[PDB]
Design an enzyme around this catalytic site. Structure first.
Site, PDB file in Angstrom:
ATOM      1  N   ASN A 171       6.307  -1.084   3.339  1.00 48.65           N
ATOM      2  CA  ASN A 171       5.556  -0.952   4.498  1.00 48.65           C
ATOM      3  C   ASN A 171       6.461  -0.747   5.716  1.00 48.65           C
ATOM      4  O   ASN A 171       6.094  -0.018   6.775  1.00 48.65           O
ATOM      5  CB  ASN A 171       4.303  -1.615   4.753  1.00 48.65           C
ATOM      6  CG  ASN A 171       3.375  -1.490   3.452  1.00 48.65           C
ATOM      7  OD1 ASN A 171       3.481  -0.762   2.789  1.00 48.65           O
ATOM      8  ND2 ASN A 171       2.396  -2.664   3.588  1.00 48.65           N
ATOM      9  N   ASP A 191      -9.075  -4.044   0.377  1.00 50.07           N
ATOM     10  CA  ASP A 191      -7.756  -4.631   0.882  1.00 50.07           C
ATOM     11  C   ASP A 191      -8.366  -5.609   1.925  1.00 50.07           C
ATOM     12  O   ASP A 191      -7.874  -6.664   2.134  1.00 50.07           O
ATOM     13  CB  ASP A 191      -6.772  -3.884   1.058  1.00 50.07           C
ATOM     14  CG  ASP A 191      -5.601  -4.627   1.504  1.00 50.07           C
ATOM     15  OD1 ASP A 191      -4.677  -5.271   1.032  1.00 50.07           O
ATOM     16  OD2 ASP A 191      -4.932  -4.517   2.941  1.00 50.07           O
ATOM     17  N   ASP A 201      26.197   4.798 -16.659  1.00 54.05           N
ATOM     18  CA  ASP A 201      27.412   5.162 -16.133  1.00 54.05           C
ATOM     19  C   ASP A 201      28.210   6.064 -16.911  1.00 54.05           C
ATOM     20  O   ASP A 201      28.231   5.841 -18.068  1.00 54.05           O
ATOM     21  CB  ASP A 201      27.920   3.780 -15.767  1.00 54.05           C
ATOM     22  CG  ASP A 201      27.247   3.136 -14.434  1.00 54.05           C
ATOM     23  OD1 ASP A 201      26.611   3.547 -14.029  1.00 54.05           O
ATOM     24  OD2 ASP A 201      27.846   2.029 -14.099  1.00 54.05           O
ATOM     25  N   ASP A 256      21.769   2.857 -10.303  1.00 55.97           N
ATOM     26  CA  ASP A 256      20.959   3.910 -10.025  1.00 55.97           C
ATOM     27  C   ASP A 256      19.909   4.095 -11.080  1.00 55.97           C
ATOM     28  O   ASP A 256      19.293   5.187 -11.325  1.00 55.97           O
ATOM     29  CB  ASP A 256      21.746   5.208  -9.783  1.00 55.97           C
ATOM     30  CG  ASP A 256      22.371   5.788 -11.082  1.00 55.97           C
ATOM     31  OD1 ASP A 256      22.347   5.000 -12.005  1.00 55.97           O
ATOM     32  OD2 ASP A 256      22.546   7.154 -11.172  1.00 55.97           O
ATOM     33  N   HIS A 273      -7.721  -9.978   2.253  1.00 61.18           N
ATOM     34  CA  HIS A 273      -6.840 -10.790   3.358  1.00 61.18           C
ATOM     35  C   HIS A 273      -7.453 -11.777   3.812  1.00 61.18           C
ATOM     36  O   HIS A 273      -7.059 -12.816   4.050  1.00 61.18           O
ATOM     37  CB  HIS A 273      -6.241  -9.779   4.080  1.00 61.18           C
ATOM     38  CG  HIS A 273      -5.302  -8.675   3.667  1.00 61.18           C
ATOM     39  ND1 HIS A 273      -4.385  -9.084   3.010  1.00 61.18           N
ATOM     40  CD2 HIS A 273      -5.338  -7.404   3.865  1.00 61.18           C
ATOM     41  CE1 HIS A 273      -3.642  -7.948   2.621  1.00 61.18           C
ATOM     42  NE2 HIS A 273      -4.173  -6.912   3.005  1.00 61.18           N
ATOM     43  N   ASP A 306      -4.375   0.808  -5.529  1.00 60.56           N
ATOM     44  CA  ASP A 306      -2.853   0.891  -5.171  1.00 60.56           C
ATOM     45  C   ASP A 306      -2.132  -0.786  -5.678  1.00 60.56           C
ATOM     46  O   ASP A 306      -0.984  -0.699  -5.749  1.00 60.56           O
ATOM     47  CB  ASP A 306      -2.593   1.295  -3.705  1.00 60.56           C
ATOM     48  CG  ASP A 306      -3.339   0.357  -2.891  1.00 60.56           C
ATOM     49  OD1 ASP A 306      -3.968  -0.627  -2.942  1.00 60.56           O
ATOM     50  OD2 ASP A 306      -3.198   0.927  -1.802  1.00 60.56           O
ATOM     51  N   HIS A 307      -3.066  -1.480  -5.736  1.00 61.64           N
ATOM     52  CA  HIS A 307      -2.408  -3.017  -5.965  1.00 61.64           C
ATOM     53  C   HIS A 307      -3.580  -4.078  -6.123  1.00 61.64           C
ATOM     54  O   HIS A 307      -4.674  -3.707  -5.540  1.00 61.64           O
ATOM     55  CB  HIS A 307      -1.522  -3.664  -4.768  1.00 61.64           C
ATOM     56  CG  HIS A 307      -2.183  -3.424  -3.501  1.00 61.64           C
ATOM     57  ND1 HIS A 307      -3.047  -4.478  -2.841  1.00 61.64           N
ATOM     58  CD2 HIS A 307      -1.993  -2.591  -2.242  1.00 61.64           C
ATOM     59  CE1 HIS A 307      -3.510  -4.133  -1.898  1.00 61.64           C
ATOM     60  NE2 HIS A 307      -2.816  -3.054  -1.457  1.00 61.64           N
ATOM     61  N   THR A 323       0.897  -1.097  -0.082  1.00 67.67           N
ATOM     62  CA  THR A 323      -0.169  -0.061   0.196  1.00 67.67           C
ATOM     63  C   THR A 323       0.842   1.229  -0.054  1.00 67.67           C
ATOM     64  O   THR A 323       0.653   2.136  -1.014  1.00 67.67           O
ATOM     65  CB  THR A 323      -0.950  -0.175   1.358  1.00 67.67           C
ATOM     66  OG1 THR A 323      -2.228  -0.991   0.681  1.00 67.67           O
ATOM     67  CG2 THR A 323      -1.616   1.312   1.541  1.00 67.67           C
TER      68      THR A 323
HETATM   69  C1  LIG Z   1      13.360   9.126 -11.400  1.00 63.62           C
HETATM   70  O1  LIG Z   1      13.274  10.433 -11.431  1.00 63.62           O
HETATM   71  C2  LIG Z   1      13.969  10.982 -10.256  1.00 63.62           C
HETATM   72  C3  LIG Z   1      13.894  12.551 -10.315  1.00 63.62           C
HETATM   73  O2  LIG Z   1      13.661  12.800 -11.520  1.00 63.62           O
HETATM   74  C4  LIG Z   1      15.747  10.722 -10.607  1.00 63.62           C
HETATM   75  O3  LIG Z   1      16.228  11.241  -9.537  1.00 63.62           O
HETATM   76  C5  LIG Z   1      17.111  12.411  -9.573  1.00 63.62           C
HETATM   77  O4  LIG Z   1      18.090  12.171 -10.476  1.00 63.62           O
HETATM   78  C6  LIG Z   1      18.578  13.375 -10.753  1.00 63.62           C
HETATM   79  C7  LIG Z   1      20.002  13.028 -11.831  1.00 63.62           C
HETATM   80  O5  LIG Z   1      18.963  13.010 -13.061  1.00 63.62           O
HETATM   81  C8  LIG Z   1      19.510  14.082  -9.579  1.00 63.62           C
HETATM   82  O6  LIG Z   1      19.801  15.216  -9.965  1.00 63.62           O
HETATM   83  C9  LIG Z   1      18.445  13.942  -8.330  1.00 63.62           C
HETATM   84  O7  LIG Z   1      19.370  13.971  -7.298  1.00 63.62           O
HETATM   85  C10 LIG Z   1      17.509  13.083  -8.256  1.00 63.62           C
HETATM   86  N1  LIG Z   1      16.301  13.657  -7.617  1.00 63.62           N
HETATM   87  C11 LIG Z   1      15.485  12.711  -6.731  1.00 63.62           C
HETATM   88  C12 LIG Z   1      14.412  13.519  -5.957  1.00 63.62           C
HETATM   89  O8  LIG Z   1      15.865  11.498  -6.443  1.00 63.62           O
HETATM   90  C13 LIG Z   1      15.750   9.494 -11.210  1.00 63.62           C
HETATM   91  O9  LIG Z   1      17.027   9.397 -11.462  1.00 63.62           O
HETATM   92  C14 LIG Z   1      14.713   8.850 -11.889  1.00 63.62           C
HETATM   93  N2  LIG Z   1      15.067   7.357 -11.738  1.00 63.62           N
HETATM   94  C15 LIG Z   1      15.308   6.704 -12.901  1.00 63.62           C
HETATM   95  C16 LIG Z   1      15.748   5.304 -12.686  1.00 63.62           C
HETATM   96  O10 LIG Z   1      15.370   7.259 -14.006  1.00 63.62           O
HETATM   97  O1  LIG Z   2      -4.197   4.346   5.350  1.00 61.94           O
HETATM   98  C1  LIG Z   2      -4.529   5.279   4.712  1.00 61.94           C
HETATM   99  N1  LIG Z   2      -5.261   6.372   5.311  1.00 61.94           N
HETATM  100  C2  LIG Z   2      -5.295   7.292   4.424  1.00 61.94           C
HETATM  101  O2  LIG Z   2      -5.938   8.310   4.398  1.00 61.94           O
HETATM  102  N2  LIG Z   2      -4.391   6.981   3.406  1.00 61.94           N
HETATM  103  C3  LIG Z   2      -4.107   7.780   2.223  1.00 61.94           C
HETATM  104  C4  LIG Z   2      -2.626   7.642   1.908  1.00 61.94           C
HETATM  105  C5  LIG Z   2      -1.771   6.631   2.591  1.00 61.94           C
HETATM  106  C6  LIG Z   2      -0.617   6.674   2.086  1.00 61.94           C
HETATM  107  C7  LIG Z   2       0.787   6.243   2.265  1.00 61.94           C
HETATM  108  C8  LIG Z   2       1.686   6.721   1.647  1.00 61.94           C
HETATM  109  C9  LIG Z   2       1.762   7.591   0.834  1.00 61.94           C
HETATM  110  C10 LIG Z   2       0.642   8.484   0.866  1.00 61.94           C
HETATM  111  C11 LIG Z   2      -0.501   7.937   1.288  1.00 61.94           C
HETATM  112  N3  LIG Z   2      -1.726   8.368   1.514  1.00 61.94           N
HETATM  113  C12 LIG Z   2      -2.210   9.749   0.580  1.00 61.94           C
HETATM  114  C13 LIG Z   2      -2.644   9.305  -0.761  1.00 61.94           C
HETATM  115  C14 LIG Z   2      -3.890   9.010  -0.956  1.00 61.94           C
HETATM  116  C15 LIG Z   2      -4.645   8.962  -2.314  1.00 61.94           C
HETATM  117  C16 LIG Z   2      -3.425   8.863  -3.359  1.00 61.94           C
HETATM  118  F1  LIG Z   2      -3.942   8.505  -4.620  1.00 61.94           F
HETATM  119  C17 LIG Z   2      -2.277   9.012  -3.150  1.00 61.94           C
HETATM  120  C18 LIG Z   2      -1.927   9.171  -1.747  1.00 61.94           C
HETATM  121  C19 LIG Z   2      -2.388   5.527   3.497  1.00 61.94           C
HETATM  122  C20 LIG Z   2      -3.770   5.626   3.506  1.00 61.94           C
HETATM  123 CA   LIG Z   3      24.411   4.741 -13.380  1.00 66.29          CA
HETATM  124 ZN   LIG Z   4      -3.159  -5.537   1.943  1.00 69.03          ZN
END
Ligand SMILES: *[C@@H]1O[C@H](CO)[C@@H](O[C@@H]2O[C@H](CO)[C@@H](O)[C@H](O)[C@H]2NC(C)=O)[C@H](O)[C@H]1NC(C)=O
Ligand SMILES: O=C1NC(=O)N2Cc3c(c4ccccc4n3Cc3ccc(F)cc3)C[C@@H]12
Ligand SMILES: [Ca+2]
Ligand SMILES: [Zn+2]
Ligand SMILES: CCCCC/C=C\C/C=C\C/C=C\C/C=C/CCCC(=O)O
Ligand SMILES: [Ca+2]
Length: 740
Positions: free
Chosen positions: A164, A245, A628, A624, A249, A292-293, A143
């Protein structure tokens, strides 16, 4: 203090106040009141101890959602016809169409089979709005990672919510679902949507709701919040519910006891869609119904126990379940190996996180334990020796897929769109709100096809380094070793970084040879349905590999990118054997690469009417996901400047309309791709003792990948010379062939 007049505002009286143990004495008393329930009937169509009212009603904005159905002969939204929305229809003072997100925990994409007899409300939105067969969630399919993904446009590894539960060595502290630690902001990266809105002038409703607030109160509160005055009213909301969900379960996805919870959920949507109509907003607001899943069959007895594989198992901490994560309590290789292939029917596999399939993008965060287990669908893994369903497994498993639906003025009318991954939603929702998205892992424009209009019109990246086109300069004595019509059907890849490279022309293949990495970045060539290392005289020896290095390497061997075995005339093969075609391969790999080049390609070409193949190397020693640069590379061929790839890729393209030869193709394209890990042994394939026909294709499918994935890891740009629109191509590039 008191919540008199403060209930579910923006001593507390807002909707998280419980979650923090800090609401005013009278919060429960004034704000959570249930008498007579949530649905008007004739009997009461004429107080303050009630939950919703049936005459400061529409006025003060706490009607029950059915009021005008019950008391003013209006039809439930559900009962009205599907009317297209050419443009949004909002009260004056609404500067933009609000966005409301209806999210549900654990809603499996196939639940939508169940039909309008249980889920009529939810079914009007799907049928009537924009929908797709299913939505791909991110690994791990739990989740908290998928919700924040949804909120961020990022893989968990980037947003920091990698499970989680998790332990951050730099903080020394653990994150859990139950506890107060999760509340600390330091856990949370990216820019969730609510923050992006706020920074750009757009107010946000709350995205979280405490356990205690019943679902019906959550909808009333949202509908109430829409009645506020212009300069306090948020433009985006989220409703969240922990269904389906919870009951999945207990009963498992295919339980017939799932009808009821899907009923309950469809009623709540009903309230909401009735509720909007009542406020005349039912043709203003865009609604997103989104899971979410999925969920899968899982019972007590189908649990593997580590204790059966390992001696000192009290020496380790296992995050258990539908995935495993192991670290030390206070030898990694020996634990991996103690769990490698010990039963024929073993229901999990160990991995060094950097060895997990790249499509998972699950390694680049210090909260991801090096040791990782992929459990088998339908199984569990515990440390040592009620419910019937669970989830968290590999996100390419069909039971893990989930739902998306878009319905509103900005969305399209009764339109079906191909499945896609949840990392793409962020961009969209930003579009739906005229918000500039923060940097994320979605590819902007891949989901323009969901929308009536598009403020965002994507453009192709400018090429960074131009190619060289060398001719015969050198002579074979100088060394010291030891067509686009046919082979280049979508234009050359564009190199998105600074190096130096050459284009090489041949009868059977073309390539992009790197004078820095001493090998092709890419090699393109085409195969029809019915189908010695020497020097290369156009490349200075200084930027050419040598066999001396290989002969001297105890482990490393070499392979060719364009295969000799697929040559077109004995004359032509001499090219297959150029030093310019040669790359480093472990012999454990060569078995795999050889099967792919000499059996599987001709097979792919029989099944799809020719295929265009581009293969190449990938270097990602830092795991990453990005190409590279040299400094990062940790391994060369013995005594040489010849770097060793981490993986190798191929991109396999043909015509969706397979009646057309892959090279006489006028329409959409069909693409598949993989990223194969380059390893010294085949530990990963438990049947690799046998002929390659019994395990290679299985390994390859596991390492299927999007072209986009390949672009990140390469900083190449593919498909830039086609007859298709660029937004279609982004789609093509985001696509994953899953084999499920
Ligand atoms: C997914 O996107 C995030 C944000 O665009 C990327 O992470 C960033 O990487 C850049 C280099 O391109 C750095 O300058 C930042 O430090 C990163 N920001 C964050 C918030 O993480 C990430 O590279 C992307 N993932 C892939 C695999 O493409
Ligand atoms: O149990 C919950 N009770 C609640 O209000 N919940 C929204 C919630 C959860 C969460 C966990 C990680 C990050 C963001 C999260 N949200 C906010 C959210 C709600 C709807 C979305 F589409 C995206 C993020 C958990 C969930
Ligand atoms: Ca790399
Ligand atoms: Zn679950
Ligand atoms: C940059 C981030 C800005 C702040 C928001 C970031 C993270 C979330 C912050 C607050 C809300 C998070 C969790 C609240 C809990 C919700 C479920 C109930 C908790 C419980 O069961 O008791
Ligand atoms: Ca050797």
């Amino acid at each position: 203090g008191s919540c008199k007049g403060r209930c579910f505002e923006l001593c507390r009286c807002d909707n998280l106040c419980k979650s923090y143990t800090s609401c005013c004495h009278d919060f429960d008393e004034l704000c959570l009141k249930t008498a007579r329930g949530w649905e008007c009937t004739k009997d009461r169509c004429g107080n303050e101890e009630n939950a919703c009212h049936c005459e400061d009603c529409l006025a003060r904005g706490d009607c029950c959602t059915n009021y005008q159905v019950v008391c003013k002969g209006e039809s439930h939204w559900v009962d009205d016809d599907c009317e297209e929305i050419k443009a949004a229809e909002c009260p004056a003072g609404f500067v933009r169409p609000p966005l409301i997100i209806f999210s549900v925990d654990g809603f499996r994409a196939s639940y939508m089979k169940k039909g309008s007899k249980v889920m009529p409300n939810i079914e009007k939105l799907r049928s009537c709005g924009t929908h797709s067969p299913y939505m791909r969630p991110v690994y791990p399919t739990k989740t908290f990672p998928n919700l924040y993904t949804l909120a961020t446009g990022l893989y968990p590894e980037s947003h920091g919510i990698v499970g989680n539960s998790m332990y951050d060595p730099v903080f020394d502290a653990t994150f859990h679902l139950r506890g107060r630690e999760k509340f600390n902001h330091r856990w949370w990266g990216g820019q969730p949507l609510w923050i992006t809105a706020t920074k750009q002038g757009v107010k946000a409703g709350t995205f979280f709701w405490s356990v205690v607030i019943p679902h019906e109160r959550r909808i009333l509160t949202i509908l109430q919040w829409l009645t506020l005055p212009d300069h306090e009213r948020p433009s985006v909301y989220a409703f969240y519910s922990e269904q389906p969900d919870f009951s999945g379960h207990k009963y498992g996805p295919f339980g017939p006891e799932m009808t009821n919870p899907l009923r309950e959920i469809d009623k709540i949507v009903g309230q909401l869609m009735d509720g909007l109509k009542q406020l005349k907003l039912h043709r203003c607001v865009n609604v997103i119904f989104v899971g979410d899943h999925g969920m899968e069959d899982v019972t007590c007895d189908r649990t593997e126990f580590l204790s059966n594989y390992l001696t000192n198992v009290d020496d380790i901490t296992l995050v258990p379940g539908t995935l495993g994560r192991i670290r030390s309590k206070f030898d990694p290789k020996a634990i991996i190996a103690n769990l490698t292939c010990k039963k024929p029917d073993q229901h999990f596999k160990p991995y060094l996180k950097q060895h997990l399939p790249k499509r998972l993008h699950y390694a680049n965060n210090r909260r991801i334990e090096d040791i990782h287990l992929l459990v088998e669908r339908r199984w569990h893994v515990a440390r040592k020796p009620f419910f019937q369903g669970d989830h968290g497994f590999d996100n390419k498993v069909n039971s893990m897929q989930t739902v998306f639906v878009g319905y509103g003025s900005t969305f399209k009318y009764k339109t079906k769109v191909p499945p896609f991954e949840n990392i793409e939603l962020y961009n969209v929702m930003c579009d739906l709100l005229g918000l500039k998205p923060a940097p994320n892992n979605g590819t902007h424009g891949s989901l323009n096809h969901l929308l009536r209009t598009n403020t965002f019109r994507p453009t192709m990246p400018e090429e960074v380094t131009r190619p060289n086109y060398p001719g015969i300069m050198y002579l074979q004595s100088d060394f010291d070793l030891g067509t686009e019509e046919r082979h280049l059907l979508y234009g050359r890849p564009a190199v998105l970084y600074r190096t130096r490279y050459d284009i090489l022309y041949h009868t059977d293949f073309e390539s992009g040879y790197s004078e820095i990495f001493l090998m092709p970045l890419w090699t393109s060539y085409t195969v029809s349905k019915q189908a010695c290392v020497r020097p290369d005289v156009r490349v200075s020896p200084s930027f050419s590999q040598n066999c001396l290095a290989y002969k001297n390497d105890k482990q490393m061997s070499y392979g060719f990118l364009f295969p000799p075995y697929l040559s077109s005339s004995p004359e032509a093969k001499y090219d297959a054997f150029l030093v310019t075609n040669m790359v480093p391969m472990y012999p454990a790999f060569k078995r795999v690469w050889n099967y792919f080049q000499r059996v599987l390609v001709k097979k792919y070409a029989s099944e799809r009417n020719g295929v265009n193949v581009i293969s190449g190397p990938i270097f990602d020693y830092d795991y990453d996901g990005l190409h590279d640069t040299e400094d990062k590379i940790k391994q060369y061929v013995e005594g040489s400047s010849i770097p060793v790839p981490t993986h190798y890729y191929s991109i396999i393209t043909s015509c969706l309309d397979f009646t057309q030869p892959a090279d006489k193709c006028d329409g959409p394209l069909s693409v598949s791709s993989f990223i194969l890990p380059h390893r010294p042994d085949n530990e990963e394939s438990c049947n690799s003792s046998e002929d390659e026909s019994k395990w290679v294709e299985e390994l390859m499918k596991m390492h299927t990948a999007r072209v986009r994935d390949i672009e990140h890891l390469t900083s190449l740009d593919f498909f830039r010379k086609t007859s298709r629109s660029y937004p279609e191509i982004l789609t093509l590039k985001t696509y994953l062939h899953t084999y499920e």
